[PDB]
């Protein structure tokens, strides 16, 4: 559990090639002398698999993913592979599956096992009286919350140590889809020394384990043999290959045994067989698939750097209004860059409420209302929902869901003179509370008592529009801050100043993905020589195909060229002589994709011969190919 081995030598996992491994029965359908196409997770041919062994310096137990599906293939001679650990996070917090075998019964239990540091099983005292009896149990520590347990039939497995070549071939399929684990197995004797065998075997399922859990990582147990940290192992080999959702073609004989499998995503020869559903390729050009160039990135070309919003008359103005007779200004039909308003280094008060200023870039609003008023330094913090004071209860009250901003600047050399500034006024007395977005411009004399005031001052009759005090003998923070409050809301009107993704992006002569005002598509923007009309924005072909557009805020003449698309034709002779092919893509060029230029595309795979022979397989425009010496 805690004691780990110290004989681990770090070796690089080099790449290994596979020939035809990863073939098994897809479902419970028995077929014979037919050719059916299936869609399931299979091992791709000539892919990249792992390279690990179980030797007495290299003792490696790596952690491999499970979300893509793995394939297991091991060549054994002394029954070294014992079991695997099917878990999610390799801890005692989630539900895991542990399938081991102590050569007596197939132990399949679904519990909450405790993942140890390095589990290992071995045989003790190999000097004398071995008898192949195991006693060490270091696979897991505890097992609780068991919901399923499977006990197989008792048998006797020979775990003797053979020397020389391999005698057993045990392969497994480890995949899980929709909570249904499928386990396959196949055993056959082979002859092998070092490399991977280029054979063919179909795997049959043994049992069905509907665990219904998620498996992300897994390990592999190994057997140990040495004549509690310096123990060694024997000699074995195992390979792990990642599964992919490919398509096979299982060739059934008269008895039902799978004899051939063809992966359609390996070579252009396989594209002819997976299309016509026949391994016997006849003479003639056959269309298999369609080539298409994938786009690189999405580029939106809505805004530009011109046609800015009129913020110069708002932020750099001379005189403003008071807090009771403030003016409401609407700003729309422009583009406002919020990065040049943040790094101006001239605003002494720049606050925002509701949402973050870095999050409103990918967010569209429809109404912008600037509320500019002149207050003191002790009244800026009262512009907040759920507050009291001389502003929120008397002059201006914010609503609850206010997601606006507060923008102001310093007025040390603008509204500060010697003598006193009696320009602005403010209301001091009021009977009731306020409402959101309410303007009060009345000059009614407040009646504090029961006697009327008749518009003049007297007993309990004070002037409500009190004068402000701005003197040079006051504090620094008591200067009149020109507070401009922005308003934002959501209505049925569409958005005006939002910005799609950014300002501008210009990538020419490439297959990119554009985004226009009324149509989308993928094409290449190339040069042109026509003279379009300045008020036009788009342009169509005969049968309604967009091919030439104009930028709305930039006078440019560019067309829309479609990318390199077309069918894929495989030129190959019959399978009775050879298997060489000729890759031919239709409606392509020899630049974007032994290179020969044809009228139908770029032919890569055939050599140019000046000698004219008889036509065997047609290509196009009077060109033929023939498999001759």
């Amino acid at each position, epitope marked *: 559990q805690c004691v780990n081995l110290t004989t681990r030598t770090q070796l690089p996992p080099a790449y290994t090639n596979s020939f035809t491994r990863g073939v098994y029965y897809p479902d419970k359908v028995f077929r014979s002398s037919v050719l059916h196409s299936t869609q399931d997770l299979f091992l791709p041919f000539f892919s990249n698999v792992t390279w690990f062994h179980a030797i007495h310096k290299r003792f490696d137990n790596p952690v491999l993913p499970f979300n893509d599906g793995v394939y297991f293939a091991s060549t054994e001679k002394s029954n070294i592979i014992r079991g695997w650990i099917f878990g999610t996070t390799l801890d005692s917090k989630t539900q895991s599956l542990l399938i081991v075998n102590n050569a007596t019964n197939v132990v399949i239990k679904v519990c909450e096992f405790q993942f140890c540091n390095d589990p290992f099983l071995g045989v003790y005292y190999h000097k004398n009286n071995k008898s192949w009896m195991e006693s060490e149990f270091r696979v897991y520590s505890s097992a609780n919350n068991c919901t399923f347990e499977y006990v197989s039939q008792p048998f006797l497995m020979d775990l003797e140590g053979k020397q020389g070549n391999f005698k057993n071939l045990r392969e497994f399929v480890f995949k899980n889809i929709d909570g249904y684990f499928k386990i396959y197995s196949k055993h056959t004797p082979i002859n092998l020394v070092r490399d991977l065998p280029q054979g063919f075997s179909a795997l049959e399922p043994l049992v069905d384990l509907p665990i219904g859990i998620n498996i992300t990582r897994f390990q592999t147990l190994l057997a140990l043999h040495r004549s509690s940290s310096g123990w060694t192992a024997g000699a074995a080999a195992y390979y792990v290959g990642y599964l992919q959702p490919r398509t096979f073609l299982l060739k059934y004989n008269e008895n039902g045994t799978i004899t051939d499998a063809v992966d359609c995503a390996l070579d252009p020869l396989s594209e002819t067989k997976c299309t016509l559903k026949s391994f016997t390729v006849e003479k003639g050009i056959y269309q298999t698939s369609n080539f298409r160039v994938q786009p690189t990135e999405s580029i939106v070309r809505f805004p530009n750097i011109t046609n800015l919003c009129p913020f110069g008359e708002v932020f750099n103005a001379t005189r403003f209004a008071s807090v009771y007779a403030w003016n409401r200004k609407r700003i729309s039909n422009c583009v406002a860059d919020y990065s040049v308003l*943040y*790094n101006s*280094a001239s*605003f*002494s*008060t*720049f*606050k*925002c*409420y509701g949402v*973050s*200023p*870095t999050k409103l870039n990918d967010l569209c609003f429809t109404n912008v209302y600037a509320d500019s008023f002149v207050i003191r*330094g*002790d009244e*800026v*913090r009262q512009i*907040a929902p759920g*507050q009291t004071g001389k502003i929120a209860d008397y002059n201006y009250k914010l609503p609850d869901d206010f997601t606006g*901003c507060v923008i102001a600047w310093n007025s040390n050399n603008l509204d500060s003179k010697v003598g006193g500034n009696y320009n602005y006024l403010y209301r001091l007395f009021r009977k009731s509370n306020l409402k959101p977005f309410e303007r009060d411009i009345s000059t009614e004399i407040y009646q504090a008592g029961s006697t009327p005031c008749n518009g003049v001052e007297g007993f309990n009759c004070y002037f409500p529009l009190q004068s402000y005090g701005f*003197q040079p*003998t*006051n*504090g*620094v*923070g*008591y200067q009149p801050y020109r507070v401009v409050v922005l308003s934002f809301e959501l209505l049925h009107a569409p958005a005006t100043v939002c910005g799609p993704k950014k300002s501008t992006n210009l990538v020419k002569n490439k297959c990119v993905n554009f985004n226009f005002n009324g149509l989308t598509g993928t094409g290449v923007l190339t040069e042109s020589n026509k003279k379009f009309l300045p008020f036009q924005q788009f342009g169509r072909d005969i049968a309604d195909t967009t091919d030439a557009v104009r930028d709305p805020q930039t006078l440019e003449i560019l067309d829309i060229t479609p990318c390199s698309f077309g069918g894929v034709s495989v030129i190959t002779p019959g399978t009775n002589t050879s298997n060489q092919v000729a890759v031919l893509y239709q409606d392509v060029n020899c630049t974007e994709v032994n290179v020969f230029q044809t009228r139908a595309g770029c032919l890569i795979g055939a050599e140019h011969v000046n000698n004219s022979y008889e036509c065997d397989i047609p290509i196009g425009a009077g060109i033929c190919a023939s498999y001759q010496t």
Partner: antibody, heavy 118, light 108 residues
Framework: VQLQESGPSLVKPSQTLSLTCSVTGDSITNGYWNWIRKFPGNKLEYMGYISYSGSTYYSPSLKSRISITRDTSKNQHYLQLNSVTSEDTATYYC?????????????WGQGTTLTVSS | DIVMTQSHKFMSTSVGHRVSITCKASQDVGNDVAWYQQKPGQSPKLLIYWASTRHTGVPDRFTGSGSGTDFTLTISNVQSEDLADYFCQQYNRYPYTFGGGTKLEIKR
């Protein structure tokens, strides 16, 4: 301008607090005098300030239980914090925030720890 | 109210490494960002004013930048004398709500 804090370090609850932020070296001409307390546990909160004009405003957490007076004769100002609780036990400071020669500066003092307990 | 939220309360910085003290406030404050330097047993002092100019008496190993609500106090050449507490503050308006503070740790 040098700063010095003084006053009693033992304030009974539900009573009137008293402090004296001594200002020596330069008289109150331009600038404010804030009040920053330090709770045990690396948590900070603002209390209030006073100017040389006659306008006093404090934190919104304290509605009307704090009053700061001024005295331009002895260049000192007192801090009256009425109805103190057990959570008001903190280290009280006084500082000043005023620019100089078109550059921002910040002066600080020593500070004293006041314990409010029964 | 102005909520000043930092990244972590306790961090670790060895001698010679570069630590990026980030204080991601929920509300935007503009460019009025100042930082404290509080030794254990003393008063905090001003370090960086207006986020672009160092204070008189402070060496050139203290830099500061940031964009939006994601500020970064890059502390270069972290020595043994720079072990202090940092507090993101603002001189915009009252009350001066301060952050929690980030304490460094030298590994040896």
């Amino acid at each position: 301008v040098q700063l010095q804090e003084s006053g009693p370090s033992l304030v009974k609850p539900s009573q009137t607090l008293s402090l004296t932020c001594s200002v020596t070296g330069d008289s109150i001409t331009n600038g404010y005098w804030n009040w920053i307390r330090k709770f045990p546990g690396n948590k900070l909160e603002y209390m209030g300030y006073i100017s040389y004009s006659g306008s006093t405003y404090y934190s919104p957490s304290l509605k009307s239980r704090i009053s700061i007076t001024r005295d331009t004769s002895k260049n000192q100002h007192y801090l009256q914090l009425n109805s103190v609780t057990s959570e008001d036990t903190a280290t009280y400071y006084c500082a000043s925030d005023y620019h100089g020669s078109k550059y921002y500066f910040d002066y600080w003092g020593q500070g004293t720890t006041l314990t409010v307990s029964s | 109210d102005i909520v000043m939220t930092q990244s972590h309360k306790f961090m670790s910085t060895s001698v010679g490494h570069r630590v990026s003290i980030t204080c991601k406030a929920s509300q935007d404050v503009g460019n009025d960002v100042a930082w404290y330097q509080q030794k254990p047993g003393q008063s905090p002092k001003l370090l960086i004013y207006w986020a672009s100019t160092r204070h008189t008496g402070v060496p050139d190993r203290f830099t500061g930048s940031g964009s939006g609500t994601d500020f970064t106090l890059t502390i270069s050449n972290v020595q043994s004398e720079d072990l202090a507490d940092y507090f993101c503050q603002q001189y915009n308006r009252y009350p001066y709500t301060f952050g929690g503070g980030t304490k460094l740790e030298i590994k040896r």
